[PDB]
Amino acid sequence: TSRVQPIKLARVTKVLGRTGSQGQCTQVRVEFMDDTSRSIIRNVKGPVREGDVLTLLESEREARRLR
Amino acid sequence: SLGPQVAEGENVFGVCHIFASFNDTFVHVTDLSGKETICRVTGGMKVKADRDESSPYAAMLAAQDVAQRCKELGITALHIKLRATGGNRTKTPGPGAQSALRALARSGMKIGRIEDVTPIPSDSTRRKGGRRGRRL
Amino acid sequence: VVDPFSKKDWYDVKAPAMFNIRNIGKTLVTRTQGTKIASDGLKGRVFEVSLADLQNDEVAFRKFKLITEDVQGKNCLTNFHGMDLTRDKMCSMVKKWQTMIEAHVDVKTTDGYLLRLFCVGFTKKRNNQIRKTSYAQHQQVRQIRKKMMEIMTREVQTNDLKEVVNKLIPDSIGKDIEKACQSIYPLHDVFVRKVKMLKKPKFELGKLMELHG
Amino acid sequence: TKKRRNNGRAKKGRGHVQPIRCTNCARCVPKDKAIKKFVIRNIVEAAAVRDISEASVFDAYVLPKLYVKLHYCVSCAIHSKVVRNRSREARKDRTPPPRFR
Amino acid sequence: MRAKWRKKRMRRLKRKRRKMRQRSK
RNA sequence: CCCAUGAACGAGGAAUUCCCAGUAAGUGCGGGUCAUAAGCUUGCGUUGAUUAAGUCCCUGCCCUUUGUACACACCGCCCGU
RNA sequence: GCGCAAGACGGACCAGAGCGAAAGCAUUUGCCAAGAAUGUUUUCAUUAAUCAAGAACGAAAGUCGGAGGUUCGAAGACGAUCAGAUACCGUCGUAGUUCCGACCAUAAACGAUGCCGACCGGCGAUGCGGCGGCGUUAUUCCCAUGACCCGCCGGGCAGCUUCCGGGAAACCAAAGUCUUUGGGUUCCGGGGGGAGUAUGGUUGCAAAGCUGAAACUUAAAGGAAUUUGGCGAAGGGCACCACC
Ligand SMILES: [Zn+2]
């Protein structure tokens, strides 16, 4: 990497299905606060409501399946 | 050893030839002529396992080694000539090619044109195997 | 034991004058070690470059070849050797439910440069066409191929290399073929697929020096 | 008994077709009988396209695709789960399944 | 036992007995 | 019951058991066994949480489709020297 | 990376599209010869699809004589796998795979369904030829040509549906018009093994094709299809005595 990325914070807008082999992760749709034009799909471990916000070290990589 | 250009604004261009079979991978880097190579490392040179010669881990190791060698030489931009085994057999590239190209890009080296240089035939000779072929 | 990049030179290559950007890249070769001469091992090097890295803003998937034949010091001056196409574009235009037409012509310029003009052609379905097949008869394909051969032997025989190389840079021969063949069967994807060098004359330094200005 | 109205092929008035070779196996399956695959995909897949975008000397460069045609023997087409088995009434569907994804 | 190798064995037996008859005279 | 005697044991390898709210767990008290008698079992009561509102990856079970030369039902049938 | 030489093959365009009596047929161009279908207010006028004797063609493999042997590859050699491999798997490799001529005439040569002719539902498409008609295009005006669109006709490879009808059922616009049996005409089968075997003839350089029984033995061998069964087949659902 060798790239310094400032921390960007993002807000959930819709909950989706749960990925993972044991049903431990959750695919979810989350949108940013600084620029609400683009929305990203991320994998989150833990119980997630609709309405709260998230903390992201990166804002680039896409979510995927269990592996 | 070094190059006569300025190292502030502009960058130099070479080509990296990436062979990707199903049991080996190559990261071969030559000049823009394609004749004068500078450094060639293969995925079988970094792991002590004959079955693990074609993998993203060996591809990342070979890509980091050739990126370090090119940084000591001073080659700062590359064009990818990606190819599979080609020929009469299969044409799908190996699984380590994407990770090798990703690890070459992650070292801080510029990436230009990307094209597929698989030597596809019009119609080649008879392939390996019988009429029933290879079965198990 | 010793590293083999200490007795290595560095050279810069140049493109001929029909293009916009003269500087295209760099190469390197070893020093003159005894009977071997570094200029002798610098001749047989084909430079395979793209058109969009050679012009300012034009078609990117067209490609050209450059062969080195001029060196005097810290400079290599090339010439046209072949025009190719990217495989992704060629595989993108090829699709089902259409007729592919291919014509190859052997033709010579005014000077001793023997070319081989490969070309392709792909049919187009109309905007109100309800059918799916959209093929053509074999004699229609023969008439289209004859028209393509006489067009690409018309435009190379009359002129020299310096005009047809400048003509190959934009879509001119393809647009002429597409405009002429609208009456036989309307086809849209016509491009010169490959140009191959066949014969080259005795080497002359004056024409090569006047190539670059 | 006769399972299908045709014989798993597209030969009606020919009697002979040119044989092809499988990609995984080397079976000399006839061309009209084999399962033919035409897939399109990028040169590097979506796990690295952002890193490729932030490593280029160009601006908003479009990643090229890769084109390849695959010929599958039917044993290889079922073992690799390209095509599955169906019921008696569900076999009379020449249309492909819908491609939602 | 399918018919191909049964036919092959009958062919080999017939060839052996025909060779024995033709070389016995 | 009283006084002496004061070992192993420093939170435990591979492997494995049980459990979503007054729950697990730390504690005590009743009943059975009982002539003397509970480290067992069944009940009662006190204090009282961490995590989860999902999945078919592992361990099993159920169902649909397909194939069958099996119907003593694969521990089945059956080819040859 | 640059060129050189040899042999093989014509991918993507390639389709339930075309041609041919059947095997079979896919780079461009030229030469020779043939043919289905469409069109005809031309011509001969019964000259006919049916066929034992006889005759041509006939996938691959197999034999014989010439230069070639790229790839692949029977037999053979080697190394793993396995209780056991002169099997599956991998590395080499002779004869063949490639050409010209001389042979054999056997395939799941299969639409596992002879050929001609008449009749019997609908619909949507595709290939050829002909015909009719608003509109767009080869840039703007007018005609013919090609392209697209809307139909009709004739032949052909094919597709969807059914209480026409048939069949034992799978299924069939033919496998229908059949006890309410009869349009014409070649080959061919009488339970299952023995057995496509022995002998005789015939054909062939060889390998081997064609015709082809009997003695004896058995009460079964077979075709279609429904329910549990069982998969080293696929797809789902549930469970803190399964998991996170
Ligand atoms: Zn296969």
CSV table of N, CA, C and O and ligand atoms in Angstrom, one decimal, chain B residues 134, chain D residues 22-27 71-73 75-76, ligand 1:
chain,number,residue,atom,x,y,z
B,134,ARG,N,-8.2,-37.6,-21.8
B,134,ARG,CA,-7.7,-37.7,-20.4
B,134,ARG,C,-9.0,-37.8,-19.5
B,134,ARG,O,-9.7,-36.8,-19.5
D,22,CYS,N,-12.4,-31.0,-26.2
D,22,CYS,CA,-12.8,-30.4,-25.0
D,22,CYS,C,-11.6,-29.6,-24.4
D,22,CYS,O,-10.5,-29.7,-24.8
D,23,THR,N,-12.0,-28.6,-23.5
D,23,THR,CA,-11.0,-27.8,-22.9
D,23,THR,C,-10.4,-28.5,-21.7
D,23,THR,O,-9.1,-28.5,-21.6
D,24,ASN,N,-11.2,-29.1,-20.8
D,24,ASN,CA,-10.6,-29.8,-19.7
D,24,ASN,C,-10.1,-31.2,-20.1
D,24,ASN,O,-8.9,-31.5,-19.9
D,25,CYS,N,-11.0,-32.0,-20.7
D,25,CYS,CA,-10.6,-33.3,-21.2
D,25,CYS,C,-10.1,-33.1,-22.6
D,25,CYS,O,-9.8,-32.0,-23.1
D,26,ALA,N,-9.9,-34.2,-23.3
D,26,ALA,CA,-9.5,-34.2,-24.7
D,26,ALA,C,-10.4,-35.1,-25.6
D,26,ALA,O,-10.0,-35.7,-26.5
D,27,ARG,N,-11.7,-35.1,-25.2
D,27,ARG,CA,-12.7,-35.9,-25.9
D,27,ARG,C,-13.0,-35.3,-27.2
D,27,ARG,O,-13.1,-34.1,-27.4
D,71,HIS,N,-15.3,-25.2,-25.2
D,71,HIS,CA,-16.0,-26.3,-25.7
D,71,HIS,C,-16.0,-27.4,-24.6
D,71,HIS,O,-14.9,-27.8,-24.1
D,72,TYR,N,-17.1,-27.8,-24.1
D,72,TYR,CA,-17.2,-28.7,-23.0
D,72,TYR,C,-17.9,-30.0,-23.4
D,72,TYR,O,-18.9,-30.0,-24.1
D,73,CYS,N,-17.2,-31.1,-23.0
D,73,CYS,CA,-17.9,-32.4,-23.1
D,73,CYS,C,-19.0,-32.5,-22.0
D,73,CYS,O,-18.9,-31.8,-21.0
D,75,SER,N,-20.0,-34.8,-19.9
D,75,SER,CA,-19.6,-35.3,-18.6
D,75,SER,C,-18.8,-34.2,-17.9
D,75,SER,O,-19.0,-34.0,-16.7
D,76,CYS,N,-17.9,-33.5,-18.6
D,76,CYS,CA,-17.3,-32.3,-18.0
D,76,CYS,C,-18.2,-31.2,-17.7
D,76,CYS,O,-18.0,-30.4,-16.8
H,1,ZN,ZN,-13.7,-32.7,-21.1
